[PDB]
Amino acid sequence: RPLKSLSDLLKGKQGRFRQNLLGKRVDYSGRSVIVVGPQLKLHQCGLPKLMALELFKPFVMKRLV
Amino acid sequence: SAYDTPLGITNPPIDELLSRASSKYALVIYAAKRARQINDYYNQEYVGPLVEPGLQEKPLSIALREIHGDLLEHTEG
């Protein structure tokens, strides 16, 4: 396998501009499979209580103190 | 005239708020700048809240209802 040169850091899809600079993973985020929400209002979304907990973990930690 | 009672985030209506500023982006800064103001006051720019706040109202929501009632200017630089 050819060695990764300095140029290989910048250039590819793993090149910094695509893999890190413009696109990068973030905190305070989650994902899961979606199910239909027919009883929801257009401005509402169903959030699994466990997911909402970890996402808001510092917030609930603050008010519970 | 009646649309209906709005629920939570959709109150106040965006249309009645857009009449208070130039653009939607201006409206964003408006409530944002004022939202930080109110929170600074809770842990002492320090003024307000001008409207009677329901307990635990996110200072962003309070700042929105303030803009609804014309309670603040609202100068663009």
UniProtKB/Swiss-Prot annotation, chain A:
Signal peptide region: none
Disulfide cysteine pairs (residue numbers): none
Similarity section: Belongs to the RNA polymerase beta' chain family.
Entry function: DNA-dependent RNA polymerase catalyzes the transcription of DNA into RNA using the four ribonucleoside triphosphates as substrates.
Subunit annotation: The RNAP catalytic core consists of 2 alpha, 1 beta, 1 beta' and 1 omega subunit. When a sigma factor is associated with the core the holoenzyme is formed, which can initiate transcription.
Protein's UniProt name: DNA-directed RNA polymerase subunit beta'
Organism in which the protein naturally occurs: Mycolicibacterium smegmatis (strain ATCC 700084 / mc(2)155)
Swiss-Prot record, chain B:
Keyword field: DNA-directed RNA polymerase, Nucleotidyltransferase, Transcription, Transferase
Entry's Gene Ontology BP terms: DNA-templated transcription
Catalyses which reaction(s): RNA(n) + a ribonucleoside 5'-triphosphate = RNA(n+1) + diphosphate
One example GO MF annotation: DNA binding
Cystine pairings recorded for this chain: none
Enzyme class: transferase
EC number(s) stated in the UniProt entry for this protein: 2.7.7.6
Family: Belongs to the RNA polymerase subunit omega family.
Subunit structure: The RNAP catalytic core consists of 2 alpha, 1 beta, 1 beta' and 1 omega subunit. When a sigma factor is associated with the core the holoenzyme is formed, which can initiate transcription.
Protein function: Promotes RNA polymerase assembly. Latches the N- and C-terminal regions of the beta' subunit thereby facilitating its interaction with the beta and alpha subunits.
Protein's UniProt name: DNA-directed RNA polymerase subunit omega
Organism field: Mycolicibacterium smegmatis (strain ATCC 700084 / mc(2)155) (Mycobacterium smegmatis)
Full protein segment contained here: 24 to 106 of 107
